[PDB]
From a paper:
Although the actual cellular role of this protein is unknown, it has been observed that mutations of the PLPHP encoding gene affect the activity of PLP‐dependent enzymes, B6 vitamers and amino acid levels. Here we report a detailed characterization of the Escherichia coli ortholog of PLPHP (YggS) with respect to its PLP binding and transfer properties, stability, and structure. YggS binds PLP very tightly and is able to slowly transfer it to a model PLP‐dependent enzyme, serine hydroxymethyltransferase.
We serendipitously discovered that the K36A variant of YggS, affecting the lysine residue that binds PLP at the active site, is able to bind PLP covalently. This observation led us to recognize that a number of lysine residues, located at the entrance of the active site, can replace Lys36 in its PLP binding role.
Author numbering: 3 to 228
Write the structure that this text describes.
């Protein structure tokens, strides 16, 4: 039951925030509905969920159009998969957030292909913080350059950072890696305007991500199953 899992996930989030002195409202739950059918999302929506994350463009754009013509309003769609240049038009036309900005060219395409009547696309720069087997995300030493360039684009809005750490089961390493992301985030937050989103943490490391300072956790299986 999706509505029951939603409530169970929000309990774990609220628990973890409270334990480390944070207000539960500081942590946005982003329900990762990738691979989940539109019927399952519609249940989630009925249980009050409004923020949904998708890994693949055409799957995501089809859900977006579905709930639009149903006249369902007030949703927020986040593209959280790797973004190919040949699919950026659809992200720039249909999504509200994109978490995977890791090269300036792809961000300039999104800015150019973004219709003017829409609000700027909120974007996070993705950091490869600890995953040597991943080609996704920049190194921290490139952050200031990429952030400055991306910050300039008028149809985008730089909101913060995202990382998918390498899989880790030792809580100590989970926390140390997320702290590195929280430190970079704080550093960016001082100089850049409207930096308010650290997209970090999934079910396996949710506690350490929240204790380290994440503002948004990405939960998929624990909501929709597989
Ligand atoms: C294995 C795989 N999955 C998904 C995609 C992209 O999915 P979508 O067409 O929904 O954007 C690609 C792109 O070719 C792919 O190679
Ligand atoms: C970004 C992301 N978070 C989470 C999951 C799985 O959800 P859970 O956090 O419960 O492991 C997946 C895929 O289903 C995912 O792609």
């Amino acid at each position: 039951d999706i509505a029951h899992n939603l409530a169970q996930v929000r309990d774990k989030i609220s628990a973890a925030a409270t334990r480390c002195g944070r207000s539960p409202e500081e942590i946005t739950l982003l329900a990762v509905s990738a691979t989940a059918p539109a019927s399952a999302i519609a249940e989630a929506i009925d249980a009050g969920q409004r923020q949904f994350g998708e890994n693949y463009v055409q799957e995501g754009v089809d859900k977006i159009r579905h709930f639009q013509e149903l006249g369902v309003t007030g949703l927020e769609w986040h593209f959280i998969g790797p973004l190919q240049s040949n699919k950026s038009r659809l992200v720039a036309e249909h999504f509200d957030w994109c978490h995977t900005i890791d090269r300036l060219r792809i961000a300039t395409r999104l800015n150019d292909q973004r219709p003017a009547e829409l609000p700027p696309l909120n974007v996070l720069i993705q950091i490869n913080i600890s995953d040597e087997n991943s080609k996704s995300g920049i190194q921290l030493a490139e952050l200031d350059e990429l952030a400055a360039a991306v910050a300039e684009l008028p149809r985008l809005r730089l909101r913060g950072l995202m990382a998918i750490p390498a899989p880790e089961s030792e809580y100590v390493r989970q926390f140390e890696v997320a702290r590195q992301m929280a430190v970079a985030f704080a550093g960016l937050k001082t100089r850049y305007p409207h930096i308010d989103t650290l997209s970090l943490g999934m079910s396996d490391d949710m506690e350490a991500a929240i204790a380290a300072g994440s503002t948004m956790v990405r939960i998929g299986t624990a909501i929709f199953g597989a």
